[PDB]
Design a binder for this molecule. Structure first.
Ligand SMILES: [Ca+2]
Lengths: 472, 92, 15
């Protein structure tokens, strides 16, 4: 009697001043699901077509976000902009103007936290991505659809747009939505997944009618509702703080990776969104692949209000010369080096640590690497140029880069597990994985990376090393 | 310095409409003057142009309906950062 | 479920 999707986003233990904007097709605003909670702006910018059909997409999504019976955030107030015509087609320019309209509205008549849902996609667009970034930096939360072409989301916009929350779709079996050659987009530009198949919601067919629809937009609509609710509880959240919560509250490792192309399984977050039940937050950030130079370098960055606590690297062939943490524009960045040598990925661990400063100590595998007082070691990075004790980083000829943090209310512990293609070691419950690395052994390691709170080392003995922290 | 961009997915392109993006500090007054400059230089060449929208608030710049033939000229206008051909978006 | 109102699916059972 509770639709599968709404049950799925309800956490295992469970118990307004936010406005949600929708850029879509026309809306049937008097539908009983949403009547009185959606304000039609009458902003309209659509290309000519080449009636109940006209508002089916938009009405269903408004319902998923705020519908009385089938909505995620049942008490959410919405505002709609028309940027998609009756055939569900829009333009980049129309979307730019709509986004500009949202900003001007806000300057004229300021309200509270704003969530903008963008249930649409086109090809990669420099200008649309730039506009979204500027709107996000102005303090607005953007939630977008990953796209429906069973493709890398980085090739689409606004899905690839830095700072927007990009959402992919899973079904009742927590498997990625697929329909022949079509299905959910994936990859490193996707932040998480949410229910996106067989989603019951308002049908614009009749004022009380319901229909089941599927899409990365339906999935994005769940995240916008979760986001609206989270901002109601914590109106002061920054976009980075909202993203870290979405990730932290998500169900983890439930998607069967096999559905994605092989090279994309590492890059694709295995997260299905969920509401919070009524701290140190960390996330893993993958870079774009470095390319095949011998001097090629991949760079992974954190958000401005995030701290880079660790930095690891990964190459499928294994031909790599490690990684380093280095300051770029007054911000610690993660840099990975390719060996002679198809290329590498840089893998950052970005965390929300206030009452924290953090510094990098570059030294050889030097005996303690955070020599200071009350200072915790959060991560060990390592690089070399040839191709052939809680506070100390072990290595072989290699240069070490240690992330050292001053966080009086913070405790860290280092856990090792040594044994093969994959070795893992996980932090205990209540602990956050801040650093992940492998010790050099009688096996050539392809690299290491953090998957939620699990440290993964890939090799062709092998030992995984996880640094785990928590507040106290 | 000014660059041109068009959608990589060919069936999604909308030739004849361009988003002209100006350098970040450009004031709305400059965007309008740059757009009028384009129109005038275009007119001198026998081209009709239509300024559909002037942007301000997110990005400075404007939307222009014109022949692609004018891109080399428009790329030479003062304050221009990049120009992007309009393209389609779809309900997902 | 799949409706053609969402690009680019036709009418198909979903679930
Ligand atoms: Ca994103």
């Amino acid at each position: 009697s509770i639709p599968w999707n709404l049950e799925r986003i309800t956490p295992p233990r469970y118990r307004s001043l936010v406005e949600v904007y929708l850029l879509d097709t026309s809306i049937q605003s008097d539908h009983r699901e949403i009547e009185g909670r959606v304000m039609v702006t009458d902003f309209e910018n659509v290309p000519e077509e080449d009636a109940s059909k006209c508002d089916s997409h938009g009405t269903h999504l408004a319902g998923v976000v705020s519908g009385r019976d089938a909505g995620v955030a049942k008490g959410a107030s919405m505002r709609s902009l028309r940027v998609l015509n009756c055939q569900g087609k829009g333009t980049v320019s129309g979307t730019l103007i709509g986004l500009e309209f949202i900003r001007k509205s806000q300057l004229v008549q300021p309200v509270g936290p704003l969530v903008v849902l963008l249930p649409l996609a086109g090809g990669y667009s420099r200008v649309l991505n730039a506009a979204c970034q500027r709107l996000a930096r102005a303090g607005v939360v953007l939630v977008t659809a990953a796209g429906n072409f069973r493709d890398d989301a980085c090739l689409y916009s606004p899905a690839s747009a830095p700072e927007v929350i990009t959402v992919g779709a899973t079904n009742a079996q927590d498997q990625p939505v697929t329909l022949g050659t079509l299905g959910t987009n994936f990859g490193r530009c996707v932040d998480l997944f949410a229910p996106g198949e067989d989603i019951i919601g308002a049908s614009s067919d009749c004022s009380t009618c319901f229909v089941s629809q599927s899409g990365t937009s339906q999935a994005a609509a769940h995240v916008a509702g979760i986001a609206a609710m989270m901002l109601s509880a914590e109106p002061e959240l920054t976009l980075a703080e909202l993203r870290q919560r979405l990730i932290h509250f998500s169900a983890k490792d439930v998607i069967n990776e096999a559905w994605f192309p092989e090279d994309q399984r590492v890059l694709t977050p295995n997260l299905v969104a969920a509401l919070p039940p009524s701290q140190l937050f960390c996330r893993t950030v993958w870079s774009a692949h470095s390319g095949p130079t011998r001097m090629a370098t991949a760079i992974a960055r954190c958000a401005p209000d995030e701290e880079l606590l660790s930095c690891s690297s990964f190459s499928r062939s294994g031909k790599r010369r490690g990684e380093r943490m280095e300051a770029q524009g007054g911000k610690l960045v993660c840099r990975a080096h390719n060996a002679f040598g198809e290329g590498v990925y840089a893998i950052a661990r970005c965390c929300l640590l206030p009452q924290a400063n953090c510094s990098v100590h570059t030294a050889p595998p030097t005996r303690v690497h955070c020599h200071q007082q009350g200072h915790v070691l959060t991560g060990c990075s390592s690089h070399w140029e040839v191709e052939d004790q809680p506070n100390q980083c072990v290595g072989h000829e290699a240069s070490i880069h240690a992330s050292c943090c001053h966080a009086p209310g913070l405790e860290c512990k280092v856990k090792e597990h040594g044994i093969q293609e994959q070795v893992t070691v996980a932090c205990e419950e209540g602990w956050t994985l801040t650093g992940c690395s492998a010790l050099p052994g009688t096996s050539h390691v392809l690299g290491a990376y953090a998957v939620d709170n699990t440290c993964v080392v890939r090799s062709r003995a092998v030992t995984a090393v996880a640094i785990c922290c928590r507040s106290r | 310095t000014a660059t041109f961009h068009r959608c990589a997915k060919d069936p999604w392109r909308l030739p004849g409409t361009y988003v002209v993006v100006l350098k970040e500090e450009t004031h709305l007054s400059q965007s309008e003057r740059t757009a009028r400059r384009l129109q005038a230089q275009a007119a001198r060449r026998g081209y009709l142009t239509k300024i559909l929208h002037v942007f301000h608030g997110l990005l400075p710049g404007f939307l222009v309906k014109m022949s692609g033939d004018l891109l080399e000229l428009a790329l030479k206008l003062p304050h221009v950062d990049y120009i992007e051909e309009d393209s389609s978006v779809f309900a997902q | 479920x799949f409706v053609p109102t969402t690009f680019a699916f036709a009418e198909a059972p979903a679930x």
